[PDB]
Amino acid sequence: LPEDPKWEFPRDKLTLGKPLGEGAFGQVVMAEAVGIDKDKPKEAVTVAVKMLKDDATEKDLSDLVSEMEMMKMIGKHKNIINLLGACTQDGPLYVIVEYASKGNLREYLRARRPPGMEYSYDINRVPEEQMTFKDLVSCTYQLARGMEYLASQKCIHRDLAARNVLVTENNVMKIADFGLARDIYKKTTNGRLPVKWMAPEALFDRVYTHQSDVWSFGVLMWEIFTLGGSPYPGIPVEELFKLLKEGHRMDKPANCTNELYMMMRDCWHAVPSQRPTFKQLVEDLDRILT
Amino acid sequence: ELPEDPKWEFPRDKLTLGKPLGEGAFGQVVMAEAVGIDKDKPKEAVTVAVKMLKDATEKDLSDLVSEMEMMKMIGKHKNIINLLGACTQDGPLYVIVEYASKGNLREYLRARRPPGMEYSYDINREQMTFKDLVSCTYQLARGMEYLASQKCIHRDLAARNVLVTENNVMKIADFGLARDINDYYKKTTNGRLPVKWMAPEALFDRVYTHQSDVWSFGVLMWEIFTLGGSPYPGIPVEELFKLLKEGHRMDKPANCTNELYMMMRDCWHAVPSQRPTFKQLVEDLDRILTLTT
Numbered sequence: 001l002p003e004d005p006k007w008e009f010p011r012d013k014l015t016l017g018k019p020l021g022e023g024a025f026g027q028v029v030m031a032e033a034v035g036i037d038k039d040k041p042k043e044a045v046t047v048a049v050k051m052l053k054d055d056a057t058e059k060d061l062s063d064l065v066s067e068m069e070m071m072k073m074i075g076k077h078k079n080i081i082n083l084l085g086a087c088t089q090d091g092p093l094y095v096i097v098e099y100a101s102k103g104n105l106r107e108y109l110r111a112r113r114p115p116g117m118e119y120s121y122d123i124n125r126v127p128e129e130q131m132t133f134k135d136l137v138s139c140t141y142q143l144a145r146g147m148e149y150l151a152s153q154k155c156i157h158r159d160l161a162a163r164n165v166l167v168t169e170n171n172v173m174k175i176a177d178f179g180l181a182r183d184i185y186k187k188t189t190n191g192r193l194p195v196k197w198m199a200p201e202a203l204f205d206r207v208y209t210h211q212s213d214v215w216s217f218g219v220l221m222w223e224i225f226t227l228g229g230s231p232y233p234g235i236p237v238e239e240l241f242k243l244l245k246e247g248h249r250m251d252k253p254a255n256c257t258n259e260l261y262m263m264m265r266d267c268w269h270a271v272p273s274q275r276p277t278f279k280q281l282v283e284d285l286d287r288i289l290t
Numbered sequence: 291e292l293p294e295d296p297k298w299e300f301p302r303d304k305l306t307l308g309k310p311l312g313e314g315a316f317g318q319v320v321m322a323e324a325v326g327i328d329k330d331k332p333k334e335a336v337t338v339a340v341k342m343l344k345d346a347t348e349k350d351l352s353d354l355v356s357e358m359e360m361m362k363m364i365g366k367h368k369n370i371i372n373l374l375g376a377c378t379q380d381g382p383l384y385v386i387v388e389y390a391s392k393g394n395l396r397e398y399l400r401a402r403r404p405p406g407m408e409y410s411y412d413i414n415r416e417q418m419t420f421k422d423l424v425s426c427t428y429q430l431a432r433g434m435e436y437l438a439s440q441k442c443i444h445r446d447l448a449a450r451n452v453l454v455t456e457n458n459v460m461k462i463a464d465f466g467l468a469r470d471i472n473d474y475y476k477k478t479t480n481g482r483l484p485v486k487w488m489a490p491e492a493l494f495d496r497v498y499t500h501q502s503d504v505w506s507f508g509v510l511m512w513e514i515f516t517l518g519g520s521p522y523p524g525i526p527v528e529e530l531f532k533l534l535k536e537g538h539r540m541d542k543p544a545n546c547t548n549e550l551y552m553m554m555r556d557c558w559h560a561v562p563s564q565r566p567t568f569k570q571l572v573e574d575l576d577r578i579l580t581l582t583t
């Protein structure tokens with residue numbers, strides 16, 4: 001792998017830590033980096049490094065490099081997990097990205113559900129108490145702002161879901177895993193069946209567009225206002241195909257205004273060209289915030 | 291097998307292909323004609339250009355589909371090559387866009403330079419005036435300000451990618467193309483080295499913004515008032531990196547007022563946040579155009 005001084009970070013100044021989780025690209029590990037912020041070059045900063053699992057092929061290795069080199073292309077934004085640097089030449093490939101202390105969004109919302117209406121036993125959070133409606137509309141607004149940035153850079157996400165959203169310690173929403181490569185199932189990875197987030201054109205024809213991500217914004221909105229519900233609850237994958245081309249759609253979440261739910265279904269238009277653009281989603285969510 | 295969209299489907303019977311025109315990164319574009327593509331006049335044949343694949347991969351098919359469906363989202367404008375229809379489901383994919391009879395701008399301008407002032411041996415054409423040149427820039431700024439408002443970044447704005455219709459309307463083209471993994475870009479594509487149209491911040495950080503699109507507008511202006519000149523004449527690409535961040539810029543073209551050349555340099559501002567918006571470019575370009583004669 002060629003050198004890149006603009007992005008290279010020395011492994012001496014990088015100290016690994018406890019693992020965080022795993023994804024389609026490998027595993028992501030907590031870490032600390034000394035001087036990764038050039039402005040404050042004697043400061044330890046908490047970071048997350050993305051690396052391969054101990055059983056990955058080179059197909060998986062080029063797919064880690066090809067996400068890293070795409071993260072350099074699309075720039076930085078407040079509502080995405082940004083790239084900080086990399087370790088290339090010696091040993092394993094580390095990819096250093098921003099750290100979000102409050103974890104991922106789906107389990108953040110599930111932990112803050114009302115008593116007796118939990119998803120699973122797990123552990124609840126009453127220091128966090130419970131979220132308000134205005135709380136919820138700004139999380140999607142932040143994500144619309146972030147999705148409108150990625151769309152403007154001609155980037156397609158292909159798998160936008162609440163589990164792939166991350167929360168910083170100031171409750172900032174950060175879209176993650178947007179540079180992954182596309183390689184043409186019933187395999188639940190990380191607790192989710194990804195086919196339930198796909199637009200019909202990507203589910204039946206395996207074709208993706210910025211409009212297809214708009215379909216996956218709609219489901220994301222449904223996850224948010226149900227505080228982490230699971231879409232199409234308990235429906236077999238074999239039946240979603242038939243149910244989808246029949247015109248059936250998900251029901252209106254409680255504690256959610258009609259105009260938001262009528263915005264939810266316009267993302268689920270059968271024709272991609274008929275779905276809203278990210279630009280008007282940002283216009284409408286801003287107006288609804290006040 | 292591509293999804294349906296009735297509003298945009300055009301029957302393949304009524305479309306008869308013709309001689310090829312040229313190519314881009316997206317495939318080939320070929321002359322053709324379509325009967326009834328204009329619904330208001332349904333018994334009329336209209337000349338169109340259709341974009342199709344060259345052979346090209348399964349990846350190349352998705353980037354045509356996402357360029358076609360992105361052209362539907364950003365709307366229509368007088369100063370861009372607009373989408374007219376498509377043939378999707380029953381055969382190979384055809385994307386039908388507007389036809390500009392006079393070809394691209396760079397060779398349009400080069401064909402119209404004075405005797406003895408040629409760029410190359412091509413049969414010439416009937417010479418453009420100063421008012422001709424300024425309204426040509428105004429039209430293109432109007433088109434870029436529309437594209438910017440729809441959150442669109444061009445990334446490769448050059449005279450060769452502007453086309454002229456039969457009444458001299460300027461139309462920006464290839465604005466919805468997908469972004470791939472970085473071409474060396476130092477290889478001549480379509481008679482130009484695209485690296486000479488890139489802003490330094492997009493050169494050194496490989497990230498594109500609306501402020502960089504203004505930088506390539508400035509280069510574009512230089513192309514126009516030199517009637518199809520070649521930017522940075524005889525400078526090696528390996529030296530252009532240093533030469534740009536050293537502050538060197540192209541010289542003021544003849545038959546071009548000082549205020550236009552100092553507008554050209556404000557496009558080439560070192561600080562991107564300081565370059566003007568297209569919104570302000572059309573406002574100033576409007577002012578220069580109406581004190582024409």
Ligand SMILES: CNC(=O)c1cncc(-c2cnn3cc(-c4ccn(C(C)C)n4)c(N[C@H]4CCOC4)nc23)c1
Pocket residue numbers: 020021022023028048081097098099100101102103104164166176177190
């Ligand atoms: C499956 N992971 C991704 O897809 C991913 C991709 N790129 C960057 C990340 C990432 C970035 N900051 N970050 C912070 C944490 C974290 C912090 C505190 N906790 C626990 C103790 C509550 N977990 C984290 N943990 C995983 C575990 C479950 O969900 C996120 N993942 C990340 C994640």
Ligand SMILES: CNC(=O)c1cncc(-c2cnn3cc(-c4ccn(C(C)C)n4)c(N[C@H]4CCOC4)nc23)c1
Pocket residue numbers: 311312313314319339341371387388389390391392393394450451453463464
């Ligand atoms: C990189 N080009 C594009 O991407 C593109 C995309 N979509 C539509 C076009 C297009 C639309 N109308 N049109 C007309 C002509 C033309 C007419 C008359 N001539 C001369 C050769 C006799 N050439 C034309 N010629 C090509 C050949 C040289 O420059 C462009 N291209 C177009 C172009």
